[PDB]
Amino acid sequence: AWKGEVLANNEAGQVTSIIYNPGDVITIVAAGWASYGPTQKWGPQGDREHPDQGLICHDAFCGALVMKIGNSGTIPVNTGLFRWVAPNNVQGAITLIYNDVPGTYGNNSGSFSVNIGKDQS
Amino acid sequence: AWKGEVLANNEAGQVTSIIYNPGDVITIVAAGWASYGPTQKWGPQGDREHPDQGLICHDAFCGALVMKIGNSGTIPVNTGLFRWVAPNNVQGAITLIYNDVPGTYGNNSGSFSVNIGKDQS
Amino acid sequence: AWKGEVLANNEAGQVTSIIYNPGDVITIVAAGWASYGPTQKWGPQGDREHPDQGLICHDAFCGALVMKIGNSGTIPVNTGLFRWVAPNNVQGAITLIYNDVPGTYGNNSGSFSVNIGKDQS
Amino acid sequence: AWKGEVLANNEAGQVTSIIYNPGDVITIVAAGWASYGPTQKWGPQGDREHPDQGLICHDAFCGALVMKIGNSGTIPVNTGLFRWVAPNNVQGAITLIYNDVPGTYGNNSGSFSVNIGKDQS
Numbered sequence: 001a002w003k004g005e006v007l008a009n010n011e012a013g014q015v016t017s018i019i020y021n022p023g024d025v026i027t028i029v030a031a032g033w034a035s036y037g038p039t040q041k042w043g044p045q046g047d048r049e050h051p052d053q054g055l056i057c058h059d060a061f062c063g064a065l066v067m068k069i070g071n072s073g074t075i076p077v078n079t080g081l082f083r084w085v086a087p088n089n090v091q092g093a094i095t096l097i098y099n100d101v102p103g104t105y106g107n108n109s110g111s112f113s114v115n116i117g118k119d120q121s
Numbered sequence: 122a123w124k125g126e127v128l129a130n131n132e133a134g135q136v137t138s139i140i141y142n143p144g145d146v147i148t149i150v151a152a153g154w155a156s157y158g159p160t161q162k163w164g165p166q167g168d169r170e171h172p173d174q175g176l177i178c179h180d181a182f183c184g185a186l187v188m189k190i191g192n193s194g195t196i197p198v199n200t201g202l203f204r205w206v207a208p209n210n211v212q213g214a215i216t217l218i219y220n221d222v223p224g225t226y227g228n229n230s231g232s233f234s235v236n237i238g239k240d241q242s
Numbered sequence: 243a244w245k246g247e248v249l250a251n252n253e254a255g256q257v258t259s260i261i262y263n264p265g266d267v268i269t270i271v272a273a274g275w276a277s278y279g280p281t282q283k284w285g286p287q288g289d290r291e292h293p294d295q296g297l298i299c300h301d302a303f304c305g306a307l308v309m310k311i312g313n314s315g316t317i318p319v320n321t322g323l324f325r326w327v328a329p330n331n332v333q334g335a336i337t338l339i340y341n342d343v344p345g346t347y348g349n350n351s352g353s354f355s356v357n358i359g360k361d362q363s
Numbered sequence: 364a365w366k367g368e369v370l371a372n373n374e375a376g377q378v379t380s381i382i383y384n385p386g387d388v389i390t391i392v393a394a395g396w397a398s399y400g401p402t403q404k405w406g407p408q409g410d411r412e413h414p415d416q417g418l419i420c421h422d423a424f425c426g427a428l429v430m431k432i433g434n435s436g437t438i439p440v441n442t443g444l445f446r447w448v449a450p451n452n453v454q455g456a457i458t459l460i461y462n463d464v465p466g467t468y469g470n471n472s473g474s475f476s477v478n479i480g481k482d483q484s
């Protein structure tokens with residue numbers, strides 16, 4: 001398993017120790033409070049009222065937790081994933097990223113606490 | 122495993138099929154949007170800026186997801202629990218509940234989507 | 243999970259720390275060498291060529307590993323049980339027992355090493 | 364998970380659908396009866412009193428169940444593996460094989476029944 005923090009102001013995201021392999025089943029739980037710039041903080045689903053002005057993941061709100069698996073595009077994580085299998089052809093290291101517009105991460109704050117594990121299959 | 126929805130306006134909460142027994146390890150993942158009355162909605166961690174004016178769970182924000190195991194006191198769930206063991210002497214059915222002040226659930230709206238499973242132990 | 247040894251000469255059996263509850267999935271793996279009296283030893287399936295002269299478990303060979311769950315009847319274990327669910331109304335502590343004829347355990351020797359754990363459900 | 368059989372008479376062994384990846388935790392349970400030549404049969408631990416005359420696995424008895432992960436050397440399985448991680452950084456398909464001396468499998472008989480699954484990690 002892996003446990004760590006994902007900082008909101010880290011544009012690169014947080015590379016984890018988890019290599020997603022074909023057939024793997026995973027669980028992710030994410031918690032905490034972060035901001036993309038405003039004084040308010042939001043949980044790992046982000047800000048449901050905020051427009052998309054060029055986010056790295058168009059399928060999750062601004063301030064949401066997302067991931068990449070190896071060379072994949074961004075995939076929503078939000079609060080987590082329960083006994084989840086990736087699309088076919090998706091494999092590699094899991095990188096966790098805060099969802100914001102490229103070049104706008106430097107005014108972000110807080111973080112999410114994240115647990116990842118592989119499940120029975 | 123149990124998969125379902127917890128309505129914000131349900132004071133009695135949602136009795137699940139999960140009977141937590143001594144030694145069990147569980148995983149919960151919770152998602153979605155709910156309100157305790159205001160226009161805004163919050164995710165399963167609730168509203169970090171709301172005062173506690175007699176919530177059913179003093180250890181989570183207003184609008185958070187919480188639970189009881191049998192006739193335990195309320196236990197915060199928030200976005201979820203990763204490979205979690207309950208406090209000693211706590212056992213019985215898991216009841217999922219929206220965190221609000223008793224008698225004030227009638228103006229609530231939304232729901233959380235929740236998965237629970239027992240893990241290897 | 244539980245790990246321990248079950249002596250062949252222990253007519254009362256080896257009580258484990260595992261309480262089997264309704265809906266539990268378990269895994270057991272057993273190894274080692276034991277005898278019901280002859281100088282030969284057998285593994286946890288017992289001796290396939292030995293007649294049943296009044297064994298505690300008529301659905302396992304002489305010298306096999308068997309169990310009781312609470313005060314159930316004997317249930318064969320042999321080399322182990324892979325992601326197994328018990329029969330209806332069976333619950334309680336797992337006791338591991340060597341399969342021999344009652345009152346004839348005194349000339350037994352050796353032991354099996356056993357791992358038990360609970361699986362996802 | 365994978366369920367199937369491996370013949371005592373097959374030098375090539377039984378290629379499974381399980382691809383063991385770095386970090387994977389697996390469980391194997393094996394059962395059944397086989398001989399490397401004599402009229403007697405043994406379970407998956409093989410014959411503890413037999414000399415090694417050039418077995419494919421020097422770290423298991425003659426008549427034992429062993430395996431390869433990809434093109435690894437042989438690894439003992441015996442009655443099974445409980446929540447086991449591969450000690451060397453091996454990867455690839457699990458191949459199950461009966462432990463005998465190469466060129467001497469012609470007088471072998473029987474088979475083992477095997478379950479393999481990936482565990483939580």
Ligand SMILES: O=C(COc1ccccc1)N[C@@H](Cc1cn(CCNC(=O)c2ccc(S[C@@H]3O[C@H](CO)[C@H](O)[C@H](O)[C@H]3O)cc2)nn1)C(=O)NCCO
Binds near residue numbers: 036037049105160
């Ligand atoms: O839609 C609403 C209001 O409606 C609600 C609110 C609550 C409940 C229900 C409805 N949302 C807002 C009102 C609102 C809506 N709009 C239009 C959309 N907003 C913007 O144009 C807007 C654009 C950018 C930014 S902050 C800006 O965001 C960028 C990413 O997009 C970068 O990270 C950058 O670093 C950051 O500094 C902030 C606002 N502007 N204000 C609100 O409620 N304000 C209070 C602060 O939370």
Ligand SMILES: O=C(COc1ccccc1)N[C@@H](Cc1cn(CCNC(=O)c2ccc(S[C@@H]3O[C@H](CO)[C@H](O)[C@H](O)[C@H]3O)cc2)nn1)C(=O)NCCO
Binds near residue numbers: 401413414415416470
């Ligand atoms: O009791 C004895 C010894 O008896 C003696 C011998 C001399 C003097 C006094 C007593 N034997 C014991 C233990 C024992 C002793 N030894 C060493 C002597 N045996 C051998 O070297 C031996 C070697 C090979 C074979 S069968 C032979 O095995 C090969 C792989 O090794 C190939 O698979 C081949 O295809 C197959 O045909 C069978 C026996 N191996 N096991 C036993 O367990 N036998 C079965 C009954 O319990």
Ligand SMILES: [Ca+2]
Binds near residue numbers: 036037100108
């Ligand atoms: Ca920003």
Ligand SMILES: [Ca+2]
Binds near residue numbers: 158221222225226228
């Ligand atoms: Ca309310």
Ligand SMILES: [Ca+2]
Binds near residue numbers: 278279342346349350
């Ligand atoms: Ca005896």
Ligand SMILES: [Ca+2]
Binds near residue numbers: 463467
């Ligand atoms: Ca042979």
